[PDB]
Design a protein around this ligand. Structure first.
Ligand SMILES: Nc1nc2c(ncn2[C@@H]2O[C@H](COP(=O)(O)OP(=O)(O)OP(=O)(O)O)[C@@H](O)[C@H]2O)c(=O)[nH]1
Ligand SMILES: Nc1ncnc2c1ncn2[C@@H]1O[C@H](COP(=O)(O)OP(=O)(O)CP(=O)(O)O)[C@@H](O)[C@H]1O
Ligand SMILES: Nc1nc2c(ncn2[C@@H]2O[C@H](COP(=O)(O)OP(=O)(O)O)[C@@H](O)[C@H]2O)c(=O)[nH]1
Ligand SMILES: CN[C@@H](C)c1ccc(F)cc1
Ligand SMILES: [Ca+2]
Ligand SMILES: [Ca+2]
Ligand SMILES: [Ca+2]
Ligand SMILES: [Mg+2]
Ligand SMILES: [Mg+2]
Ligand SMILES: [Mg+2]
Lengths: 54, 352, 438, 423
């Protein structure tokens, strides 16, 4: 039951009690993902229009 | 109309409780995966406790206490007793036990040998028994060499504890036995001891000069009905109930079952369950638990009672399924979900 | 001094952010017009509160905050609300139609068209900082914007501010206050893509906030305002160290250092006490021991789970009010002899304690009673994995039938991203089990 | 500003559509001349969803009235709120469609559809942010059925990413005008399966039974049936017309109701349906709302399972007691809710009740029991088609038998799709 690193100031204090010792994707890659999904949306809409044209 | 799901088809106890619940015409059984249940008769292993109590508007109850395995595992029970101040290492009603991991894997090997060498030197009885939860796999020997080598041949944790060389032997027969007590703990953590117990007796005369034949040393109902040639001779199914056992203690030892044995059993049950109550209590939890326990005791020739193990998913004696299963519904289920005596239990009062 | 930029995404994030900055102002003595009389340095200063507030020459104190929502009705509340004067228009970003509870729609379809704008507005705030620490990102799991656009924002932030910390305050979905069936889908999709980009995430389960409001505040049917005022008290407790003088959790990096030994396991459990109803005749004031002991009761945890059956990796006690270290150590000693507190063997069994003498501030006319002392415990338990299991299970039930999947595929997301995200959660569940179970 | 463009096509579509605007105009305080005379700001909060604002603070419905004969739309223009509609929004011909899907869809309708889309475009161009469209029509006639589904197809082509929503009256031999109604309904259903996001199935048989058995009307009329549709349309759109959170947007509603794209056909229900002054308790609202006798698709829900349910409660009541009763119905009958969609029952509350009611509840169910409705249609269709009976009315308009065979297959596929998820 030890207390360590007691820090005190006018607005409070902080300390530590020990009870027992122990025993990314680049900007380019993000644009591709975003554009790939947009391309799949476009391909799906084109197929819808192609179906409606028929 | 209350709803319940079944997730252990192999439970004879709750198969009857489920059969009773439906008979009341006020309980409905849902598919085992339907989450909108009031009551779960859960599986033995890996019961998904973390999914209980998150259904808006449903008070949910389960027939197992999360964490009670600490008491119902051979190795866990030993560790719990030795490390818990409430039970202490000097606990007088539990045989001297040690947790021994096979060498192919803390471990109490050296601690066990030290106490063993002491007994060997002091001319004392030095017979130990080795067992584990992964058994149907038991060995009784007076040589430490055989006990340790038998565990290495296996691959799971084991426990070596002192074998009760001076057991109480029923007469006629000169035969060993153990006492099974059923204990139901409800959601409020009341401890109810079923008034009916069973003595699972050995139909063979006890023989201390031959631990090789384990039919007169192991009182398991399966071993007696498979390897014992006098099965069913003295009592039906090697099962003596309290009425007969109490009468015997009166005719033979001029004492009563309550005075000589039952007080110790009730004391042991209380101690064990009160010890783990802070860890498994569901008092302030989002769901509620109850559980049926099977306590196993040994009685020595001094009328001292010893705890053998605790079973978390016990079966019952055929003759006592109706009474007990009804009692489970009365105090465990209907207390939380009431329906539109002379209790069969014995409430062991205690401080929460 | 180092600045912190708060980002509020979606309805949940924006309305929670509205409640926090309301509380922040009351705590620092800032009026709705931005004026702060106690600030004797007009138009500047590197005080602790300046980590969250910038200053104009006219003495206004402006939150370092950005509000983003793909639909304008929620942010229009800020523009005309009590604190409309705090923020300037550049800080409030709104689109015209939302993501419809569809992660793919917030992340891909709509996110792709507004991401650069949001980053530009954030860049403006960052340019006012002499030493930016990082970001605090508030959002929900279930919303299409909260889930879908946040993950896109977190990825870009890691690219534009590689060395900056990012903390999350995430709203875990609760059916009692949710009307979207697909929120398990969104929660898991956004956890997967955000996992490697967030240094520390504080999950708040609406089910827990809801029950605390009904149980302790006697609110029969709590509203978002009830839920959000309670949530901003916890957020305030967690961020007070950045806004006030102190030595514990004084910068964003210290949250990871103190609470997250393993990067993926960065979801501390938050526990708060006491929550007292203001409508009470008058409440007996709780002691340091009582409010500390309450930190180990499930009923006051931000996520319903059972820490008794997990393992702790770290533990911070954040006290506010009349609290001296003497009483703290006394309460802790008593709680160890009674509570089931198991730490992982590779971590010390201890507590980092922080005390701020200013007791909790409560919004006038709110639901919370003024108390003389309160505490918020931040503990990293494996028990919080229960919340992942509940969520992953609901995901599996629907995904086995591909229910609602067509909505996500229709927005340009591949079906494989579902299973990819699910397998990542399966790995997250395995990591918790390896750390907490024997 | 999430505007919806309303379209009503054909006789049934225009008569039911008319009553709809009469009902909701009252709820929002709009008088027959479009002047607002309400007393609650909640009325105007979302008024722009269905109304445009003209000079002088006039509110003009965003509705397009379509028909191939003038008769029914003259009745509207002469009806109670006839003057409230934009005069330019009346688009009609003189030929009629003779209860003939082919005439509405391929011949007579095709000649008129372009002028309808001109008005649709005009309304959409003035929308700040168009949500989508809602169409009221019947499937048993020629204009609403044939031209209506032609309109959806051409609207989808021009607004592919908006939500298409319909209130579709299904024919029944008990309330029948012509024997070809099964033909027209089967042809339309295939269109709807493809080109609508949400279709409220309104069965004239259910409406009849409710008027006869529950409402005790000795001789029900189309007017009586339409009173139930008006009340139902007002209930299901409450989430759109007042402030809310659950399904408060067409696309958000679709996201939570439609787990599979082709299974988007809903069973609506209303309560009360009435001792008419007695107060109605929250339990009674819930019991009735879920009662089959209160539903308008003539399908027994106990014959299938609910994929998703949306409930709306209107009036000043105990929201706590609402959650309790809703949770009581789910927990007391969870065998009728698929277990593989957690929390598929969502409840919303609105404080403004309908005219002349302390409180009410509207029910919206995506149930697999709806397959019973398509089975009835399919059976009647096949009974005639196997003998090619009455086919000449259709082949005389350029159609081939192959098109009927394909419509048949498509609806039987739909029924099979409902069956697999019911198991
Ligand atoms: N605690 C709390 N939860 C909220 C609040 N607002 C929404 N939620 C929760 O957030 C989830 C829905 O996500 P939203 O934030 O509303 O959706 P969104 O981020 O605006 O994204 P959209 O789909 O575009 O609307 C549900 O689980 C709600 O319970 C709030 O103000 N406070
Ligand atoms: N220390 C000991 N001394 C004497 N006998 C012992 C003993 N430990 C075990 N036994 C004997 O072993 C039998 C059962 O052992 P144990 O209970 O450990 O195995 P088990 O768990 O498979 C049977 P159950 O679970 O039904 O009680 C008892 O009947 C008892 O007679
Ligand atoms: N509920 C209701 N159904 C109607 C009404 N008018 C016609 N119907 C039904 O609609 C079908 C006839 O379609 P109708 O609208 O008259 O043909 P259309 O004008 O060519 O579209 C038949 O099934 C009728 O039972 C009405 O006012 N109310
Ligand atoms: C179909 N014939 C007309 C007269 C009719 C209308 C409504 C109704 F409920 C019953 C009959
Ligand atoms: Ca200053
Ligand atoms: Ca990073
Ligand atoms: Ca012509
Ligand atoms: Mg056993
Ligand atoms: Mg939103
Ligand atoms: Mg007609």
């Amino acid at each position: 039951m030890e207390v360590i690193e007691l820090n005190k100031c006018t607005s409070g204090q902080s300390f530590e009690v020990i009870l027992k010792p122990p025993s990314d994707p680049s900007l380019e890659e993000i644009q591709k993902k975003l554009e790939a999904a947009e391309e799949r949306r476009k391909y799906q809409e084109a197929e819808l229009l192609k179906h409606l044209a028929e | 109309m209350y709803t319940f799901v079944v997730r252990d088809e192999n439970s004879s106890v709750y198969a009857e409780v489920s059969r009773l619940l439906l008979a009341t015409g006020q309980w409905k059984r849902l598919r085992k995966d339907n989450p909108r249940f009031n009551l779960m008769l859960g599986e033995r292993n890996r019961l998904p406790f973390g999914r209980l109590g998150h259904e808006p508007g449903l008070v949910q109850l389960v027939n197992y206490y999360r964490g009670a395995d600490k008491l119902c595992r051979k190795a866990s029970l030993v560790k719990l007793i030795k490390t818990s101040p409430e039970l202490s290492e000097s606990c007088t009603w539990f045989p001297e036990s040690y947790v021994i991991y096979p060498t192919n894997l803390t471990d109490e090997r050296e601690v066990f040998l030290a106490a063993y060498n002491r007994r060997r030197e002091g001319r004392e009885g030095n017979v130990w028994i080795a067992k584990s939860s992964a058994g149907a796999g038991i060995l009784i020997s007076s040589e430490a060499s055989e006990l340790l080598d038998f565990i290495d041949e296996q691959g799971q944790v084991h426990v070596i504890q002192k074998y009760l060389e001076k057991p109480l032997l029923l007469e006629p027969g000169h035969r060993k036995f153990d006492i099974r007590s059923w204990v139901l703990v409800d959601h409020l953590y009341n401890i109810y001891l079923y008034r009916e117990g069973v003595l699972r007796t050995s139909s063979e005369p006890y023989n201390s000069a031959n631990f090789q034949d384990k039919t007169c040393h192991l009182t398991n109902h399966c071993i007696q009905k498979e390897y014992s040639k006098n099965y069913g001779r003295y009592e039906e199914g090697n099962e003596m109930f309290f009425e007969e056992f109490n009468q015997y203690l009166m005719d033979a030892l001029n004492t009563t079952l309550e005075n000589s044995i039952l007080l110790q059993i009730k004391h042991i049950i209380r101690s064990c369950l009160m010890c783990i109550e802070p860890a498994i209590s569901t008092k302030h939890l989002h769901y509620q638990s109850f559980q049926l326990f099977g306590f196993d005791f040994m009685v020595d020739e001094e009328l001292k009672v010893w705890l053998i193990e605790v079973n978390g998913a016990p079966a019952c004696a055929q003759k006592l399924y109706a009474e007990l299963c009804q009692g489970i519904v009365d105090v465990a289920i209907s207390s939380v979900f009431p329906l539109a005596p002379t209790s069969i239990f014995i409430k062991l009062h205690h401080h929460h | 001094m180092r600045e912190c930029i708060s980002i509020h995404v979606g309805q949940a994030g924006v309305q929670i952010g509205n409640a926090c900055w309301e509380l922040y102002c009351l705590e620092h003595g800032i009026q709705p017009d931005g004026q702060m009389p106690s600030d004797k340095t007009i138009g500047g200063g590197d005080d602790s509160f300046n980590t969250f507030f910038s200053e104009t020459g006219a003495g206004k104190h402006v939150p370092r905050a950005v509000f983003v929502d793909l639909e304008p009705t929620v942010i229009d509340e800020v523009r005309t609300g009590t604190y409309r004067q705090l923020f300037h228009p550049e800080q409030l970003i709104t689109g015209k139609e939302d993501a419809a509870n569809n992660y793919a729609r917030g992340h891909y379809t709509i996110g792709k068209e507004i991401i650069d704008l949001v980053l530009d507005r954030i860049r403006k705030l960052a340019d006012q900082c002499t030493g930016l620490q990082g970001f605090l990102v508030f959002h929900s799991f279930g919303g299409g914007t909260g889930s879908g656009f946040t993950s896109l924002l977190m990825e870009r932030l890691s690219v534009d501010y590689g060395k900056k910390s990012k903390l999350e305050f995430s709203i875990y979905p609760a059916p009692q206050v949710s009307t979207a069936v697909v929120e398990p889908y969104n929660s898991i999709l956004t956890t997967h893509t955000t996992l490697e980009h967030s240094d520390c995430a504080f999950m708040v389960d609406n089910e827990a906030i809801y029950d605390i409001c009904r149980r302790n505040l006697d609110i029969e049917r709590p509203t978002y305002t009830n839920l959000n005022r309670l949530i901003s008290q916890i957020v305030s407790s967690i961020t007070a160290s950045l806004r006030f003088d102190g030595a514990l959790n004084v910068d964003l990096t210290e949250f990871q250092t103190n609470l997250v030994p393993y990067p993926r396991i960065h979801f501390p459990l938050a526990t708060y006490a006491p929550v007292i109803s203001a409508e009470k005749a008058y409440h007996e004031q709780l002691s340091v021991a009582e409010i500390t002991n309450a930190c180990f009761e499930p009923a006051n945890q931000m996520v319903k789970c059972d820490p008794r059956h997990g393992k702790y990796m770290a533990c911070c006690l954040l006290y506010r009010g009349d609290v001296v270290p003497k009483d703290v150590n006394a309460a802790i000693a008593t709680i160890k002899t009674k509570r089931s507190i198991q730490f992982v063997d590779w971590c010390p069994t201890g507590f980092k304690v922080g005390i701020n003498y200013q007791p909790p501030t409560v919004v006038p006319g709110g639901d919370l009673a003024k108390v003389q002392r309160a505490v918020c415990m931040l503990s990293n338990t494996t028990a919080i994995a229960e919340a992942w299991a509940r969520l992953d299970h609901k995901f599996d039930l629907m995904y086995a039938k591909r229910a609602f999947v067509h909505w996500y595929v229709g927005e340009g997301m591949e079906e494989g991203e579902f299973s990819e995200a699910r397998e990542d959660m399966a790995a997250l569940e395995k990591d918790y089990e390896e750390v907490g179970v024997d | 500003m999430r505007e919806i463009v309303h379209i009503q096509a054909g006789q049934c579509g225009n008569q039911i559509g008319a009553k709809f605007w009469e009902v909701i105009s009252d709820e929002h305080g709009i008088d027959p001349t479009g002047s607002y005379h309400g007393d609650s700001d909640l009325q105007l909060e979302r008024i722009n969803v269905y109304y445009n604002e003209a000079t002088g603070n006039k509110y003009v419905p965003r509705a397009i009235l379509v028909d191939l004969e003038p008769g029914t739309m003259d009745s509207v223009r002469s009806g109670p709120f006839g003057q409230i509609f934009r005069p330019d929004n009346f688009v009609f011909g003189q030929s009629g469609a003779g209860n003939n899907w082919a005439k509405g869809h391929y011949t007579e309708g095709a000649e008129l559809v372009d002028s309808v889309l001109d008005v649709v475009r005009k309304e959409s161009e003035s929308c700040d942010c168009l949500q989508g469209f809602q169409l009221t029509h019947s499937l048993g006639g020629g204009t609403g059925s044939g031209m209506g589904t032609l309109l959806i197809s051409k609207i989808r082509e021009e607004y592919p990413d908006r939500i298409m929503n319909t209130f579709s009256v299904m024919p029944s031999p008990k309330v029948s005008d012509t024997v070809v109604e099964p033909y027209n309904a089967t042809l339309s259903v295939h269109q709807l399966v493809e080109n609508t996001d949400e279709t409220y199935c309104i069965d004239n048989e259910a409406l009849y039974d409710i008027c006869f058995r529950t409402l005790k009307l000795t001789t029900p009329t189309y007017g009586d049936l339409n009173h139930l549709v008006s009340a139902t349309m007002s209930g299901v759109t409450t989430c759109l017309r007042f402030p809310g959170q659950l399904n408060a947007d067409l696309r958000k509603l679709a996201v939570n109701m439609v787990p599979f794209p082709r299974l988007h056909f809903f069973m609506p229900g209303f309560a009360p349906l009435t001792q008419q002054y007695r107060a109605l308790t929250v339990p009674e609202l819930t019991q009735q709302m879920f009662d089959s006798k209160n539903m308008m698709a003539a399908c027994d829900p106990r014959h299938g399972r609910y994929l998703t349910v949306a409930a709306i409660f209107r009036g000043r009541m105990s929201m706590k007691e609402v959650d309790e009763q809703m949770l009581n119905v789910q927990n007391k009958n969870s065998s009728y809710f698929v277990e593989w969609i957690p929390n598929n029952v969502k409840t919303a509350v609105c404080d403004i009740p309908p005219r002349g009611l302390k409180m009410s509840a509207t029910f919206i169910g995506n149930s697999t029991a709806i397959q019973e409705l398509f089975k009835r249609i399919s059976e009647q269709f096949t009974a005639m088609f196997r003998r090619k009976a009455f086919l000449h009315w259709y082949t005389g308009e350029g159609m081939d038998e192959m098109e009927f065979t394909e419509a048949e297959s498509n609806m039987n596929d739909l029924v099979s799709e409902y069956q697999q998820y019911q198991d």
